[model samples]
Target chain A: TLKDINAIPDDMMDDIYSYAYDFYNKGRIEEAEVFFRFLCIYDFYNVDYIMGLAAIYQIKEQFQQAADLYAVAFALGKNDYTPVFHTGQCQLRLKAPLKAKECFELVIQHSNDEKLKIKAQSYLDAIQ
Target chain B: GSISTAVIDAINSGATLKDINAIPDDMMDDIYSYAYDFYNKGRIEEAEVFFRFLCIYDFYNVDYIMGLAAIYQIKEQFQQAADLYAVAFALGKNDYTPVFHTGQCQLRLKAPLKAKECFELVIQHSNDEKLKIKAQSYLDAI
Candidate 1:
């Protein structure tokens, strides 16, 4: 199984990530997707890589996929609330009002960033 | 007792242990990930050590440069932060976000004139609407 394959050397991961970012920066989105997919599998716990892919998906308007990846990123980045905020935005785009509200409420309850908390509150209030 | 010559050699060579094949590439990534994790957990000293090591070896990496710059900013060492942000801006291929951050550091360093230039440059070159607006606001404030 591919899952059983040996992981690439950790030191090399940044180089891989650099290439991925460059591809993304150049608007070679599919190429970035290939490398990002590789990275997500190789280092499943990396919040940055997850966010990178999620953002691409969001850009492409694959809202559900973006939301799913954002959910994972939110869980992995315990102190980072931006992912949940994005997840709520994705849910709103998906027309899932309740889930969007839930995600927004979560951000308001747990986030440390005052700006983000206020943003979440605004979203939740608008929903209500 | 003395430090290992191999350790000193790697440092002197300006190459990471992974670069010289003294450590597995996999271990290097683990170190990179750990460095970021430590910073996120507010272990700035530990994060600083790893970021400095990474900068010494991977001098062109924007992420490593940005991490150390962020630590400097957190410590209120505006000069160092501004320098690293400039390096990061260069490494990022003229990404104005780093320039904006450099502006922040410059302002805190009491170099309002230099910071104003950075903010102005950001407004001049950045295409991101939010960033441009933010840069313009900073420019106006200064």
Candidate 2:
């Protein structure tokens, strides 16, 4: 099954991503979840699928699962700020201000954009 | 006079459901008012279900759409929430609330690039110094 799953090509991945995001945009969340999960099965380490599924989990309000998946995606994509930002948001929602502050700090340091930095700082300020 | 992108897309894509015959016209306002009441009470699930009902009947109502999106935000469905907020923002006639909210959702969705557009729009329109400072902070981080 691992071999079969890995046989999925890049073009197929794109197709699935488009399909999934269309459903996401259209608010067909449950349908989007199915495709996003399928993509994750084949491309577990890909930040796109991991983030996509994690976003759906957030919609479902499965905070722990979303936070865990965000961590995995953050670890897998070092340059990606999305996972860390979302992880911080999840941490905040989970009532762990200290953990959230740590994630926001990383986001603030890594992002060059001031708007994002300000928001992260705002979160940090709120924590204190 | 202008239709929103979200409404256009929903129309072009066609309705997911068809063949609902008996419906009262006033039901839209009634349902929306009830949904708002639910939301004000923090009965998110009840509000969400009712808003979904309103969306099914009148997909063009920005208030109902935004209300539903607000529930999604509370539930932490950031992407879905963002899309709905986008729809609301697209339809807004000068109100900054939807744009501000869209930026917040985009930030949560980790699309700072998109969020930047929203924050900029809010800054351009709003006179609230505190809000501008907050928006400026996000801009600085980005």
Candidate 3:
């Protein structure tokens, strides 16, 4: 008895995403999760929807789960390094320094976002 | 407090509520998908919360109860899992999956006798040939 995925209009995706994103920004993570989860089902391939949910898990301290989702988001986004950086953070929380290092290393190497590269390098140094 | 614990507590305490429409009916299925997604990811804690909420809001839905029961089983709270599975078995009209799972939890709980009862039921009552075979293996083990 599940709803048909994409039952919501494709046009509403942006509105719902905005709602979920606002909830997240307001620190209403659980509420954000409800909307984000609904969005992910509606648009399984949407990187923002997946990233939003992963961010909630990361905040909830479910690092491994968050990391897995972030990895998925990164794979889907391809060029976006934000999820990769977040995965590194999750790895650190999971006590996986080597994996964290790899994530950060990848970000520093390939991320065009100068700020993220700097931050990744800082995390790399902190690891050492 | 958490989805996982909320589900465990709901099952352990036999919590139920009328289908009150606490969440809009249209959104409920999407929420179920969300809960199931969490489950597939091994995010049982997250899965549990929504399943618990779903069970409360739609007490007649076996899938919600089974989802909660599965989480309890994953968390190794065998008694709670078994109890929840029993509820699901009652609701699931000819569904032996819960019974098979109940047997699994019974075995974990060290109640081989109870486990045998569950496995026997699956073997005798269930139509799934593979499930029946699995139940027979459990029965033979006991």
lDDT of 3 at A123: 96
Question: What docking tier does model 1 reach?
Answer: incorrect
Distance from true position, residue A120, model 2, in Å?
37
- In candidate 3, stretches whose alpha carbon ends up further than 4 angstroms from where it belongs are A1-128, B1-20
State interface RMSD in Å for all models: 16.7, 15.6, 17.5
**Which candidate has the highest DockQ of all?**
2
True contacts kept of each: 0.00, 0.00, 0.00
Give the CA lDDT, 0 to 100, for residue A48 in model 3. 81
Isolated chain A TM-score, each model: 0.79, 0.86, 0.90
In the range A17-51, model 1's lDDT, one tens digit per residue, is: 99999999999998997888777766555679888
lDDT per residue as tens, model 3, B37-77: 99899888898888877875764467787888888888999
Q: What's the TM-score of chain B for every model shown?
A: 0.80, 0.75, 0.83
DockQ of 3: 0.01
